[PDB]
Amino acid sequence: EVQLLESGGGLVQPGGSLRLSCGASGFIFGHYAMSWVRQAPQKGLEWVSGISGGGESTNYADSVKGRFTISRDNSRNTVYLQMNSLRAEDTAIYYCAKDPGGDSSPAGRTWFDPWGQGTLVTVSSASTKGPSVFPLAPGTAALGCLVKDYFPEPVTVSWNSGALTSGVHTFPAVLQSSGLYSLSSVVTVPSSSLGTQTYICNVNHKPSNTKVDKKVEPK
């Protein structure tokens, strides 16, 4: 059961540095080349870098050559993307992807299976701001949380620490005129449960170490 789990994304000032990591499990890691592929807000998928199973061979896209360094640890089963001299145009969701058959040459000249969930890298001069979360108070009622005025993306919203997942809609963030994002997460529940079932949204904004739990009660 092949799994790839990326981490390390966040806000970086232009010219700054960031290192992404990708944890792999469920296969003999050292037998397979790994690549990083990114997806820009307005652009498509763009391959960034690939590395052979043992790591002796690497390849890079021209747009990142010399600023990005790919490496891997065949004991910790991790692949890394070191990014220096980051530019605004490096803003993207960065994915970890596996060479399906083994060790294709040049590194990365293959299709990929599978891909990780991606980690968002935002290169910007703007400063981090965490969200304020406000309740959206309510035979099925609707309620939710308003996640207002944060930067950069993303926020994650869970309900009752994951106990409530059915009927949840977390809307895409919309960029306000302030340069800050805002979104809502709503959920429909039986009206008969309102007074007795507690509803809490768990908002997580990793760029700012903001974790807020907001109780949503009928008014």
Binding site: G44, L45, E46, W47, N59, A61, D62, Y95, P100, S104, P106, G108, R109, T110, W111, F112, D113, P114, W115, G116, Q117, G118, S132, F134, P135, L136, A137, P138, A142, G144, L146, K148, H169, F171, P172, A173, V174, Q176, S182, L183, S184, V186, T188, K219
Partner: protein
């Protein structure tokens, strides 16, 4: 680099019908010596990474339902999805692996057409917590409707509003093929307290006449 161009950029297809997505490469990605086309199709569902569907232009990857098929060779390629299912809502990407750097198509967005479903409408006043900060957000929710096209109009004391609202729409649901939509009206605390009746009017193909949800204060 090799340029991959998909056509169309987006399309809507009804459930049970056939969807066709095309991709062209700026050079042949067919090698004559080994009778192999170095081409692949991916599916990227909402919130998920891409998943490979087709390798070698036409080989269906393991686990992919056989209603997906890839065809073509050389420079002109086609992804065919028969008997469209709700879970097929996705962006479909092509990729060549003939020469480094591998390159991807810009993506084709697949929309599922389904029967009309009217939105469930809810309106939410600003929290007292938010009011102490000087801003009031009023939120209108349109839940689980189809088609995507909908008209949300804010009225304050029956006066039509403009320029102070924003909308957001969910990705199409992978199970029931509906959308949900939020409209957020943002007023200063001073302006919010100047008026009484806040109303959200929704116009939609599944509603025979517009539906209004409102509150006072």
């Amino acid at each position: 680099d090799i340029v991959m161009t998909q056509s169309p950029d987006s399309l809507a297809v009804s459930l049970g019908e056939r969807a066709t997505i095309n991709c062209k490469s700026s050079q042949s990605v067919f090698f004559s010596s080994n009778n192999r086309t170095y081409f692949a199709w991916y599916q990227q569902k909402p919130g998920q990474p891409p998943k490979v569907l087709i390798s070698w232009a036409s080989t269906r990857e393991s686990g992919v339902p056989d209603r997906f098929s890839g065809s073509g060779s050389g420079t002109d390629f086609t992804l065919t999805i028969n008997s469209l299912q709700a879970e097929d809502v996705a962006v479909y990407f092509c990729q060549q692996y003939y020469s480094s750097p591998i390159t991807f198509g810009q993506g084709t967005r697949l929309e599922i057409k389904r029967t009309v479903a009217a939105p469930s409408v809810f309106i939410f006043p600003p929290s007292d917590e938010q009011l102490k900060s000087g801003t009031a957000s009023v939120v209108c929710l349109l839940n689980n409707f189809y088609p995507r096209e909908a008209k949300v109009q804010w009225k304050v004391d029956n006066a039509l509003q403009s320029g102070n609202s924003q909308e957001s729409v969910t990705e199409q649901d992978s199970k029931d093929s509906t959308y949900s939509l939020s409209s957020t009206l943002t007023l200063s605390k001073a302006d919010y307290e100047k008026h009484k009746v806040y109303a959200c009017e929704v116009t939609h193909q599944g509603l025979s006449s517009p539906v209004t949800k409102s509150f006072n204060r």
